[PDB]
Write an enzyme that holds these catalytic residues in place. Structure first.
Site, PDB file in Angstrom:
ATOM      1  N   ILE A   1      -3.938  13.038   4.207  1.00  0.00           N
ATOM      2  CA  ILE A   1      -3.606  11.788   3.511  1.00  0.00           C
ATOM      3  C   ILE A   1      -3.306  10.657   4.513  1.00  0.00           C
ATOM      4  O   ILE A   1      -3.717   9.514   4.302  1.00  0.00           O
ATOM      5  CB  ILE A   1      -2.415  11.983   2.530  1.00  0.00           C
ATOM      6  CG1 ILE A   1      -2.812  12.928   1.382  1.00  0.00           C
ATOM      7  CG2 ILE A   1      -1.936  10.653   1.949  1.00  0.00           C
ATOM      8  CD1 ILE A   1      -1.638  13.601   0.703  1.00  0.00           C
TER       9      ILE A   1
ATOM     10  N   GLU B   1       0.817  -1.224   0.000  1.00  0.00           N
ATOM     11  CA  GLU B   1       0.000   0.000   0.000  1.00  0.00           C
ATOM     12  C   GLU B   1       0.849   1.273   0.000  1.00  0.00           C
ATOM     13  O   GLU B   1       0.526   2.237  -0.702  1.00  0.00           O
ATOM     14  CB  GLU B   1      -0.973   0.021   1.191  1.00  0.00           C
ATOM     15  CG  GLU B   1      -2.180  -0.892   1.022  1.00  0.00           C
ATOM     16  CD  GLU B   1      -3.043  -0.523  -0.177  1.00  0.00           C
ATOM     17  OE1 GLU B   1      -3.478  -1.441  -0.903  1.00  0.00           O
ATOM     18  OE2 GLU B   1      -3.268   0.683  -0.409  1.00  0.00           O
TER      19      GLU B   1
ATOM     20  N   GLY C   1      -7.466   0.973  -4.638  1.00  0.00           N
ATOM     21  CA  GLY C   1      -6.493   1.067  -3.552  1.00  0.00           C
ATOM     22  C   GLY C   1      -7.125   1.389  -2.209  1.00  0.00           C
ATOM     23  O   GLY C   1      -8.177   2.033  -2.147  1.00  0.00           O
TER      24      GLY C   1
HETATM   25  O1  LIG Z   1       7.468   7.257  -0.937  1.00  0.00           O
HETATM   26  C1  LIG Z   1       6.202   7.494  -0.485  1.00  0.00           C
HETATM   27  C2  LIG Z   1       5.785   6.851   0.672  1.00  0.00           C
HETATM   28  C3  LIG Z   1       4.524   7.098   1.186  1.00  0.00           C
HETATM   29  C4  LIG Z   1       3.697   7.995   0.545  1.00  0.00           C
HETATM   30 CL1  LIG Z   1       2.142   8.362   1.236  1.00  0.00          CL
HETATM   31  C5  LIG Z   1       4.087   8.629  -0.613  1.00  0.00           C
HETATM   32  C6  LIG Z   1       5.344   8.375  -1.135  1.00  0.00           C
END
Ligand SMILES: Oc1ccc(Cl)cc1
Ligand SMILES: Nc1nc2ccccc2[nH]1
Ligand SMILES: Oc1ccc(Cl)cc1
Lengths: 188, 185
Positions: B79, B27, B84
């Protein structure tokens, strides 16, 4: 409950000096007194257990157990998980909370950890009695420095409360040293 | 997030056999790939740490840090905390999560515990680089029996992703035994 978890101090009070810790007990006691006043006999029992958890029992009607049409869970769970400050705050800031409701000839049981129910409210057996019991273990991630319940702080407050709530028997028990008190003002 | 905490298996997958545990990584990787795809350099690094945490880095733009007008907190926090399946699920089921965003000349840091932010997203320094990094410690209250990350389960999935995401470089590193791979189509 995430609002309470983000800023525990805003809801319960100071989490270091022990004032917030004892306010957890008194919030639960206010709900118990509320329940006890609905019945004729009206007794609550506050017990300090040897593992520094506190239980509060009443012999009232018992918190509603039926499914809430909007929320889709027991009405008891809605009270424990939806935002005095509310028992949901106490639940949120307790690393464990045990709920036992005796109502309509049935024993209902549910366990929470940090406000999260471990399973749906379940009928586990039968009973002739009615009432609600909540036992909570204060979260040591939230409550620092002063983490143990002082008997005198609870004893004083419950004595003051007895005179404002006529006909309500309030028992305090300490399982650590065996000390106990019975506050029962029958005025009016 | 309480809905996720209530029934973790329904969001992440089976929390006992190791399926859910590894899906936590995947995820986070999905979000890292999206971010990597819109950067100049298109590399992500997945690292298995000795203390049984996993970090996922990208070298993209960095996720938005400005205040979200409705929620009243950083867009990054929205976020991480609002549904997903999404990284908010990963955050909710992690006993600790470290967020680091390099964006607009600034380094931003935030720590979560069980999905709860310990402080607001804060500017901690300056930088020329850009990107996002999330390191998470899976909650041992949620994840039972299979609690340790198997290297080959991650390597298999990241290999599959490298074919589908042709532009993106994917590095895998195990700090427990020094094992490593580099998937790139
Ligand atoms: O490399 C990354 C890791 C986590 C998220 Cl939310 C976005 C980019
Ligand atoms: N230990 C711990 N602390 C928590 C706080 C929120 C939800 C779950 C949690 N488990
Ligand atoms: O005895 C009682 C009654 C209600 C509640 Cl919420 C807690 C304890």
């Amino acid at each position: 409950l995430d609002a309470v978890r983000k800023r525990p101090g805003m809801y319960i009070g100071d989490t270091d000096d022990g004032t917030g810790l004892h306010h957890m007990v008194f919030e639960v006691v206010d709900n118990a007194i509320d329940e006890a006043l609905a019945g004729h006999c009206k007794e609550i029992i506050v017990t300090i257990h040897a593992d520094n958890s506190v239980s509060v029992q009443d012999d009232g009607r018992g918190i509603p157990t039926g499914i809430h049409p909007e929320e889709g869970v027991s009405a008891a769970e809605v009270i424990m998980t939806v935002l005095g400050v509310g028992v949901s705050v106490v639940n949120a800031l307790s690393q464990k909370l045990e709920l036992v409701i005796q109502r309509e000839g049935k024993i209902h049981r549910q366990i929470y950890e940090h406000g999260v129910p471990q399973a749906p409210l379940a009928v586990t057996g039968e009973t002739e009695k009615t009432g609600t019991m909540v036992r909570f273990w204060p979260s040591l991630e939230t409550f620092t420095n002063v983490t143990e319940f002082e008997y005198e702080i609870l004893a004083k407050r419950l004595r003051e409360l007895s005179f404002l709530n006529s006909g309500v028997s309030i028992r305090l028990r300490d399982k650590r040293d065996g000390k106990e008190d019975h506050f029962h003002y029958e005025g009016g």
